[PDB]
């Protein structure tokens, strides 16, 4: 898994691969690693697939409420404290490694959370078995004051780093952008560089090939 | 010792043109010992199907669990549960036991009565939803199944055809797995109708 986050002049963006695996076997060739916490607070996750979705929804929920109760848009530092204390509560057993970013009345924000519950903040970050590849790229092409379009390429490149040079990551690239005054855009399948070449032959078996013994109908409606 | 590997079993489901299919083998054994050759692993609640491979006691329990949960849903909502939804139910129901899981690998297949687009999904033992628009597999012969499917599959297959495909996938992947086989069943599904056929296979 490869997840990245890069801050830019008036917002933030994050991205991730789409390979989910049970060991050396690809479980989902395009699973979604970006999670909506609140309209303008999104988080990306690597680690145990299920924990990333769970701790993400759980908090997403606890957040949604908190806002209604305060008639205020949510703040990242909140999702962050909420995520971190939960994770730290569970001594590390919730394999969720997350990059959480988004916009709120106080500004733009970017952070990272490790499953043991420690947090970090910076202008660019990455995590996952592809962490190293991308971080490399990130250390190779970043510079302060990046535009929206410059940032995306950056983050896009970095994932591609992961995809190509890490068995644990692959397929497509998911990107989400969050800018200070606009609605947030979820770009699912921004890049699709791994399409299967047409198969060489067709195995449409002539009908009847299979040997059947008994055959019946089933009753659905009551 | 690998709970997921004591009893044995495999299930696979595939999407087609306005249809879905799901199948499984009929074996139930204890390690090397074959025990029952009538352990259907596909259950259905209304028009939503779910198959479960893994530890037999859990397979059973869960099934019973989903009956209960789906029955209450119907009374409370006065309509039969839909796949997209049911799935989320299964997922949440597994994660509830994140630190002492049911050793299984559910797979879901069915169609939205309202929308009509076929649907299938699978999960790991703790909830991760495996959404794929082509095929799902599970069981001791997972590796095998993946193999069979990824090769033989092709989009928009008609009911009479998809049948063959899924059947071969199962049949053949089973034969390469010691712990699975001893019989097989396949469910073909359509908006209004559903058919259940049993297959002829080696009994070794």
């Amino acid at each position: 898994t490869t997840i990245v986050g890069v801050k830019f002049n008036n917002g933030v963006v994050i991205a991730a691969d789409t390979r989910s695996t049970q060991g050396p076997i690809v479980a989902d060739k395009n699973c979604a690693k970006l999670h909506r916490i609140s309209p303008k607070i999104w988080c990306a996750g690597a680690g145990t697939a299920a924990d990333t979705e769970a701790v993400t929804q759980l908090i997403g929920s606890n957040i949604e409420l908190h806002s209604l109760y305060t008639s205020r848009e949510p703040r990242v530092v909140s999702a962050l404290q909420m995520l971190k204390q939960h994770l730290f509560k569970y001594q590390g057993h919730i394999g969720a490694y997350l990059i959480v970013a988004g916009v709120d009345p106080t500004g733009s924000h970017l952070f990272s959370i490790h499953a043991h519950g420690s947090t970090d903040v910076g202008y660019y970050l990455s995590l996952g078995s592809g962490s190293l590849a991308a971080m490399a790229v990130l250390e190779s092409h970043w510079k302060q004051d990046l535009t929206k379009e410059e940032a995306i390429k950056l983050a896009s490149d970095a994932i591609q780093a992961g995809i190509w040079n890490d068995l644990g990551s692959g397929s497509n690239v998911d990107v989400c952008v969050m800018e200070i005054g606009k609605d947030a855009e979820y770009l699912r399948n921004y890049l699709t560089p791994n399409v299967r070449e047409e198969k060489q032959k067709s195995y449409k078996f002539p009908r009847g090939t299979t040997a059947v013994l008994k055959e019946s109908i089933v009753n659905i409606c009551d | 010792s690998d709970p997921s590997s004591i009893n044995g079993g495999i299930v696979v489901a595939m999407t087609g043109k306005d249809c879905v299919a799901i199948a499984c083998d009929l074996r139930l054994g204890s390690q090397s010992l074959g025990v029952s050759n009538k352990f259907e692993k596909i259950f259905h609640y209304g028009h939503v199907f779910l198959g479960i491979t893994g530890l037999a006691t859990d397979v059973t329990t869960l099934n019973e669990m989903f009956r209960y949960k789906t029955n209450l849903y119907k009374l409370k909502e006065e309509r039969a549960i839909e796949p997209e939804t049911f799935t989320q139910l299964v997922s949440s129901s597994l994660y509830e036991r994140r630190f002492g899981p049911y050793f299984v690998g559910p797979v879901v297949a069915g169609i939205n009565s309202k929308s009509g687009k076929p649907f299938i999904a699978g999960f790991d033992l703790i909830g991760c939803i495996d959404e794929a628009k082509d095929f799902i597999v599970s069981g001791t012969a997972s590796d095998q199944l993946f193999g069979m499917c990824e090769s033989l599959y092709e989009p928009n297959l008609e009911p009479e055809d998809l049948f063959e495909t899924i059947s071969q996938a199962l049949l053949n992947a089973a034969d390469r797995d010691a712990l699975s086989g001893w019989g097989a069943v396949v469910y073909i599904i359509k908006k209004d109708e559903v058919v259940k056929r049993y297959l002829k296979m080696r009994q070794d």
């Binding site: 989910s20 695996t21 049970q22 989902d28 690597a46 680690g47 | -």
Partner: peptide, 4 residues
Amino acid sequence: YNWX
């Protein structure tokens, strides 16, 4: 479980 899956990784994702």
